Design a binder for these strands. Structure first.
Ligand SMILES: CC(C)=CCSP(=O)(O)OP(=O)(O)O
Ligand SMILES: [Mg+2]
Ligand SMILES: [Mg+2]
Ligand SMILES: [Mg+2]
Ligand SMILES: [Mg+2]
Ligand SMILES: [Mg+2]
Ligand SMILES: [Mg+2]
Ligand SMILES: [Mg+2]
Ligand SMILES: [Mg+2]
Ligand SMILES: [Mg+2]
Ligand SMILES: [Mg+2]
Ligand SMILES: [Mg+2]
Ligand SMILES: [Mg+2]
Ligand SMILES: [Mg+2]
Ligand SMILES: [Mg+2]
Ligand SMILES: [Zn+2]
Ligand SMILES: [Zn+2]
Lengths: 402, 402
RNA sequence: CUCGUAUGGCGCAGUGGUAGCGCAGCAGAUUGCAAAUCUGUUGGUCCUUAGUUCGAUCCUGAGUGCGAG
RNA sequence: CUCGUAUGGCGCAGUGGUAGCGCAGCAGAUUGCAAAUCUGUUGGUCCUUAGUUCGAUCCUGAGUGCGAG
């Protein structure tokens, strides 16, 4: 049927560069899937692929959102799908490329449509949602459909809230809506994972951050700060839209010697991001797609042409030719990445909540662990231990008094 | 979503016995998928699972067809699906078990519906189909939609004919109908493959055949011969319906010392069938389902409980719990069976036809190889070689002639 | 002691100029027959020996084996 | 040669009773914020030694290493 190639991988592995090659070779168009690259201008830090390097290959869902609006999942689902539709009804083959692997879920119905299902929210319902208290909205969820409330920590406000918002707009238990999902991906899809040992990658990521300021990153940072300013924006705004990007908020303290620390801070966010990306691909993506993915070793750039270009084209050629791929699916060196142990095996299955009666966090609430495995980890943590000593020792102060 | 478990494997690995265990443990019903077990009575040779061993677990699409009719794919698709539907809308979980892995294709839309698409066949069209000549129907196909005619050898009458039958009833090139298929399987399916080293299996299959006659196989063979007889049936009828079963046609020459040979002949058909089954599962099934299947070593029956029962239950448990399976998917010992080399790698990709001008078969036609790889195999075969000698040697009796 | 045969795993062809097939085996195929069907293909040097002959697996003799006497 | 400072990977607190805060690191989560966000967590015995005292990282006195006229 209608083929669709998707290139995934950590930041700085050459996804875009590969996307182009495949686009030319197989007549296709790029469909960005980068939560930040969808914003107007701000190319250097948001690291967009320069036009003079796109070989004229069309790109969609990229650099079209104004800093005034906030992009998101469903905004990507409609935009991404339209592109797919279009590129298909033109004899071309779509190639979605981005580091926001989360959005990929749209490729296999992994979401809830609360839009088409309109429903006037009640004063009562709203008052609960937009409530000042944190644990109030949770207890509400725990009440109506506790099976979903047990999969979310009572502090995960964003999500716990989301779940409740669904229980209302759909009037259907979210836990049930999930047991009735398909997850089957539409369109014959070919997932390509361009990997690279962390050590080498990190080094490149650090230099790429350096020569990124040399190309005039600060000019963009200040511009961003201009709009940021004269708009009475607080640093706590850096959790919405473009303000989330890795390249602005890091220098905020500099924009009120010191600039260096804001750079090292950026080098850290990027490094962390890269690490989190692999985690998602190994614990979220792969498991979801039953593990139908092919790896591409991009650790030794001196190579690339052999390990990436060719291998990709090889797989892609058979894929597009509506034939079963004969490729090894994973080069010996990275063969372990697709193993169950490194993937589905790490996924949390125990959800029973536990509440420590002796430990409590800065927010005053008592510690709550999820899953017996981690519940024990806590019990044996120096945190819990130390807390259990002051407690015992205190209890004794009286025993001795008698 | 709606779960559906499928137990596959060669004949005599214990599929049915396992199907029951899983049925009980997980509240489900069996849906037979054995092209022969769907016929009335004739249990011993058709090897049906005895009632006193089904723990009351309901069975569908099994032993309901009269020897007068001929079962087939679409007959299975409607029957199988109805059972799935029903079993589901009752809180139960279906468990399709059978050795006719071919039918399984219904689990992932791998067929063409020429029924719902009625179309009065033309005298001209029919005269081509039901034509006495063999290569006439082929050349017709080669004309209208040669892309499909190039994937079938000009001697594969059954199929070449079928393809043409589709081009008519649907008025759509079959080659195109395939490039427009989905193949995506409906229902969240869990494929279990119960394997067993050939050597041990064969030994059991042989004894299985022996003690099969001891339980009164001949009684069924004669009964079958009764209906067969007084019906003026010729041995060439053993290509339709029940008459295909392995246990009847083998003794036909005995039914007109000798009975022994008819038994050894049966022991051979069974052995061969088992070999062919694995081939289908490794070159057809697995590749089609992108390799989402779990192996179960059933070579050492002394075990079974550990390697089969438990492992299956383990995987099944997580499956049904709508959770990502953490099981290894393949026990070290059989780990190689799921490798690409043993699977998709063996699939024929070269379809260009080749015709040897010096070699010809008993039917008078010239040899026709498919795929350069096999085209060469022929060119170097002693057949071709020997034929090229008589040719050359004869030509030399011409140069000398002048 | 009459006579007949003796060919790749089995069952068979054939030929005076160094051999074919069926089955098994191995392999490819499979979108209404699938426990069925189609396709390709690896195995011998024609029991041993001494002769006839330009040359024998196919002729003569003998031995060895097997078969109906 | 007289003063300072030496505490988990880096940076810095600190009470007489057997140690912290920040950066990182590690891990779990993710179905309208995901370059985001929530959650859990490993690390050192406080530069070595002799005293002092019931007790020392912190108190006294040496020795080691770095900074300063
Ligand atoms: C007699 C023949 C050729 C096939 C039927 S055996 P089976 O596949 O039904 O037996 P199991 O379920 O594997 O025990
Ligand atoms: Mg590169
Ligand atoms: Mg890029
Ligand atoms: Mg703007
Ligand atoms: Mg989404
Ligand atoms: Mg991390
Ligand atoms: Mg059975
Ligand atoms: Mg075979
Ligand atoms: Mg058993
Ligand atoms: Mg031959
Ligand atoms: Mg013989
Ligand atoms: Mg002579
Ligand atoms: Mg001789
Ligand atoms: Mg931290
Ligand atoms: Mg001391
Ligand atoms: Zn605690
Ligand atoms: Zn030839």
């Amino acid at each position: 049927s209608k083929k669709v190639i998707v290139i995934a991988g950590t930041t700085g592995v050459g996804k875009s560069q590969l996307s182009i090659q495949l686009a030319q070779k197989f007549n296709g168009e790029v469909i960005n899937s980068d939560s930040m690259q969808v914003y107007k201008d701000i190319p250097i830090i948001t690291n967009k692929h320069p036009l003079q390097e796109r070989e004229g290959i069309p790109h969609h869902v990229m650099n079209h959102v104004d800093w005034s609006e906030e992009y998101y999942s469903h905004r990507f689902e409609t935009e991404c799908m339209n592109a797919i539709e279009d590129i298909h009804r033109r004899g071309k083959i779509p190639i979605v490329v981005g580091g926001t692997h989360y959005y990929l879920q749209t490729l296999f119905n992994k979401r809830v449509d609360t839009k088409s299902s309109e429903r006037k929210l009640t004063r009562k319902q709203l008052d609960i949602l937009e409530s000042t208290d944190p644990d109030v909205i949770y207890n509400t969820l725990v009440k109506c459909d506790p099976d979903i409330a047990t999969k979310y920590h009572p502090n995960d406000y964003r999500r716990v809230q989301r779940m409740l918002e669904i229980y209302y707009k759909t009037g259907k238990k979210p836990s049930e809506t999930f047991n009735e999902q398909k997850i089957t991906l539409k369109f014959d899809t070919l997932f390509l994972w361009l990997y690279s040992k962390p050590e080498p990658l990190f080094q490149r990521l650090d230099d790429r951050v350096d020569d990124m300021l040399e190309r005039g990153a600060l000019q963009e940072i200040k511009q961003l700060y201009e709009y940021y300013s004269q708009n009475k924006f607080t640093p706590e705004q850096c959790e919405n839209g473009v303000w989330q990007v890795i390249g602005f908020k890091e220098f905020l303290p500099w924009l009120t010697v010191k600039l260096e620390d804001c750079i090292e801070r950026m080098k850290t966010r990027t490094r962390q991001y890269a690490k989190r990306q692999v985690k998602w691909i190994k614990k979220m993506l792969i498991p979801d797609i039953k593990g139908d993915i092919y790896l591409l070793d991009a650790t030794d750039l001196s190579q690339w042409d052999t390990n990436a270009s060719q291998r990709a084209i090889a797989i892609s050629n058979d894929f597009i030719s509506n034939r079963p791929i004969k490729q090894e699916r994973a080069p010996k060196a990275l063969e372990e990445l697709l193993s169950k142990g490194e993937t589905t095996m790490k996924k949390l299955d125990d959800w029973t909540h536990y509440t420590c009666n002796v430990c409590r966090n800065a927010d005053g609430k008592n510690v709550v662990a999820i899953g017996e495995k981690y519940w024990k980890i806590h019990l044996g943590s120096r945190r819990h231990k130390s807390n259990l000593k002051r407690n015992t020792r205190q209890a004794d102060f009286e025993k001795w008094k008698i």
